[PDB]
Amino acid sequence: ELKPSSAIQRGPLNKGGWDAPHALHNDGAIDRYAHWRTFYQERFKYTRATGKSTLIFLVAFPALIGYVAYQSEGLFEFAGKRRGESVTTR
Amino acid sequence: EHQRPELVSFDDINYNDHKKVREAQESYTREQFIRLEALKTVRKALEKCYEESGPNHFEDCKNLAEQYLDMLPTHRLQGYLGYQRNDPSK
């Protein structure tokens, strides 16, 4: 006995416009390939290869750049120069 | 009409009035461009010394070449925040 009112006359929704003809034949193999590649993260897992890449590019490589950047900080002063003069500071 | 506004130091100008602070900033800045045009003028003279000398540029303007390599670390833009934020001898 609880129904939305008899005074609605609600209809269908169109988006409106022109049916453009198909300029592309979709390939099922390429479509499911790309749908597998974009949503790759929902099925990614940790293996030995994944862990090796994550150990290098997230941990070891920022640490190597950190060693190089914080050690060689105010060494070089190549502004003028001469012969026999100090090229570094430390 | 080539206007010449006055020079205001940062020393004893009471950094609570924005008039003298901003003039001190602009004055240290504009004098720094003047300090640079000497570098840009000796470079223009050194190239004419070279192009007229030809082979004996090694001994004609050894003084201008060493002059240019002396000005080069110490005539460039350097910042008003280095001298405004810090005081020497304190």
Protein architecture, described:
- It is classed as oxidoreductase.
- Keywords: NADH dehydrogenase, Mitochondrion Proton pumping, Ubiquinone, oxidoreductase.
- This is part of a larger assembly, with chains A (90 residues) and B (90 residues).
- Chain A has 90 residues and is mostly helical.
- Chain A has helices at 28-38, 48-71.
- Chain A has one domain.
- Chain A starts with 27 loop residues before the first helix and ends in a 19-residue tail after the last helix.
- Chain B has one domain (1-90).
- Helices cover 60% and strands 0% of the residues of chain B.
- Classes of the chains: A mainly alpha (90), B mainly alpha (90).
- Chain A binds chain B through residues 77, 79-82, and chain B through 69-70, 72-73.
What gyration radius of chain B follows from the Cα positions, in whole Å?
19 Å
The oligomeric status of these chains comes to part of a larger assembly
Write down the overall geometry of chain B: elongated
- Determine the strand fraction of chain B and express it as a percent band: under 5%
Distance between the termini of chain B: 42 Å
SSE pattern of chain A, N- to C-terminal: HH
Secondary structure: number of strands of chain A? 0
| Radius of gyration of chain A from CA coordinates | 32 Å
Number of domains of chain B: 1
Query: What class, by secondary structure content of chain B?
Result: mainly alpha
The portion of residues assigned to helices of chain B is 55-70%
The shape of chain A is elongated
Helical run tally of chain A: 2
Q: Please estimate the helix content of chain A.
A: 25-40%
Distance between the termini of chain A: 90 Å
Q: Helix and strand string of chain B, N-terminal first?
A: HHHH
PDB class: oxidoreductase
Keywords: Complex I, NADH dehydrogenase, Mitochondrion Proton pumping, Ubiquinone, oxidoreductase
Entry title: Cryo-EM structure of a respiratory complex I assembly intermediate with NDUFAF2
Chain A: Subunit NUUM of NADH:Ubiquinone Oxidoreductase (Complex I)
